[model samples]
Target: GAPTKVTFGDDTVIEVQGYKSVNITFELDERIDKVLNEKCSAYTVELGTEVNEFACVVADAVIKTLQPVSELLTPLGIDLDEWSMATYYLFDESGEFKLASHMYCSFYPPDE
Candidate 1:
């Protein structure tokens, strides 16, 4: 057999123990105003009164952040519907600590 080669693609730089509010901050301009806004708003309105206070608060937080982006995207004709919303979730393998980092080495080595 050939020699075994061991290599790691990217090494995480962040280290988090236990957890906290907003462990990872990630987002981007989805650019789907009409659809996303409507869905979120409708969900809030429907769930807010039907469900509980917690649900409304959660929706408010998420919708508030993307509301501005939706305004900008509405005029661009990006009717993505559900495809516009991209929600990423992290599954922590190590129970002791969670690491969040991306190697951003533009011209330099990726390790940087």
Candidate 2:
């Protein structure tokens, strides 16, 4: 069945009414920006917003420290999004704990 619509968190829907299946791929634009900025803040790091840097520093860090098993699981399709949803449990710790954390990007028309 075709997806009639794809809605983001706030009900911002992208209509896909006529498509049998939509292939969606995600990229972290904001995180890429932030990490690029953060890396730039220091003179040692090169400046770029590539997904490798973005996902490695940001996504992998979140997956590693908070959910140690996620590194193994993410590639196998265990829903890093769901693991991200569970990260609220670490809100009160110290060091890298105060930064704003959010799950960005959602790919609909999930693989069959």
Candidate with maximal TM-score:
1
TM-score of model 2 (CA atoms): 0.21
Error of 1 at 26 (Å): 0.7
Whole-model Cα lDDT of every candidate shown, in order: 0.33, 0.35
In candidate 2, what are the lDDT values of residues 1-112, reduced to their tens digit?
3446777998798865331111112222333334323332221112223323333434344445436455655565565667454322211112222212222322221123
Best by lDDT: 2
User: What is the lDDT for 22 in model 1?
Assistant: 21
**Residues 1-112, model 1: lDDT tens digits:** 1333455558635432332232222222343334433443222122113222323343344556556676564677633343234332222223112222211101112121
Tell me the RMSD of model 1 versus the true structure: 18.8
